[PDB]
A paper describes a structure:
DOCK (dedicator of cytokinesis) proteins activate Rho family GTPases to regulate development, autoimmunity and bone homeostasis and they are involved in cancer and severe developmental and immune-related diseases. DOCK proteins are characterized by the presence of a DHR2 domain of about 400 amino acids that carries the GDP/GTP nucleotide exchange (GEF) activity, and an upstream DHR1 domain that binds membrane phosphoinositides. Here we focused on the DHR2 domain of human DOCK5 and analyzed the mechanisms of its inhibition by these chemical compounds. Finally, we used SAXS analysis of DOCK5DHR2 and crystallographic analysis of unbound Rac1-GDP to gain insight into structural features of the inhibitory mechanism of C21.
Thus, while a region important for establishing functional interactions, the switch 2 is formally not a switch region in Rac1 and it can readily engage the C lobe of the DHR2 domain. In contrast, residues 30GEY32 in the switch 1 of unbound Rac1-GDP are poorly ordered, which drives a unique conformation of the switch 1 that has not been seen in other Rac1 structures. When superposed to the Rac1/Dock2DHR2 complex, the switch 1 of Rac1-GDP lacks contacts with α6-β3 in the B lobe while residues 35TVF37 in the switch 1 conflict with the catalytic nucleotide sensor in the C lobe. We identified two such features: an unexpected conformational dynamics in DOCK5DHR2 that diminishes upon Rac1 binding, and a unique conformation of the switch 1 in unbound Rac1-GDP not seen in any of its other conformational states. In this model, the C lobe of DOCK5DHR2 features conformational dynamics that allows Rac1-GDP to bind in successive steps: first, Rac-GDP docks onto the C lobe by its structurally invariant switch 2 region; then, the dynamics of the C lobe brings the switch 1 in contact with the B lobe; finally, this interaction remodels the switch 1 to stabilize the complex, making way for the nucleotide sensor to reach into the nucleotide-binding site and promote the dissociation of GDP. This model suggests an allosteric mechanism in which C21 takes advantage of these dynamical features to stall DOCK5 in an abortive conformation where it can still bind the switch 2 of Rac1-GDP but cannot escort it to the B lobe.
Author numbering: 2 to 177
């Protein structure tokens, strides 16, 4: 069974790094591909082989009209936000969940918090504190998930690859 998973969220949340890390088994560092592409993974999680088509999107305001053109035939969505970006977290309820439901009202959602490795980073915490902001905690993320009716809430880091295999395993689990 061939599954289709669309990845949505704000620019710089780490969507492309997440997809390259997972499929390639490596963090793309500084040079991240700039072409918005689709990826694939042949994975079997307690069954027979499954091909997971992974679709990256152009998250910026400029693509608001063209982005939903990749949504038709989608099996599951990954709404992404930076755990070290409250602006991207508010955009879950503000932008991403209304837009996903607009075009696909019955399609399952997995809420994904990225840059998990930066949540304990002293420099990142200091920068946020100056702007009177705090990183998103697991209870905050889980509440937003339940609010936006997400099937599951998951955290990960494409840098350390921690929680990454789970994200796409649960994407398959939200389908089937
Ligand atoms: N520390 C850390 N940096 C990351 C992670 N994922 C992406 N990045 C960085 O975050 C920025 C955004 O990456 P990118 O995939 O292009 O974001 P996109 O616009 O959502 O696709 C880049 O500077 C990446 O190097 C992560 O899990 N942890
Ligand atoms: Mg990208």
């Amino acid at each position: 069974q061939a599954i289709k998973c669309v990845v949505v969220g704000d620019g710089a949340v780490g969507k492309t790094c997440l997809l390259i890390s997972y499929t390639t088994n490596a963090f793309p560092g500084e040079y991240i591909p700039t072409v918005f592409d689709n990826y694939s993974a042949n994975v079997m999680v307690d069954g027979k082989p499954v091909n997971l088509g992974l679709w990256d999107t152009a998250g910026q305001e400029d693509y608001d009209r063209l982005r939903p053109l990749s949504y038709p035939q989608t099996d599951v969505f990954l709404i992404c936000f930076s755990l070290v970006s409250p602006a991207s977290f508010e955009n879950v309820r503000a932008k991403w969940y209304p837009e996903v439901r607009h075009h696909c009202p019955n399609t399952p959602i997995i809420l994904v918090g990225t840059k998990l490795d930066l949540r304990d980073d002293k420099d990142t915490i200091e920068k946020l504190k100056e702007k009177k902001l705090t990183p998103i905690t697991y209870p905050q993320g889980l509440a937003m998930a339940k609010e936006i009716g997400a099937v599951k809430y998951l955290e990960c880091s494409a840098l350390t690859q921690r929680g990454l295999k789970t994200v796409f395993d649960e994407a398959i689990r939200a389908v089937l």
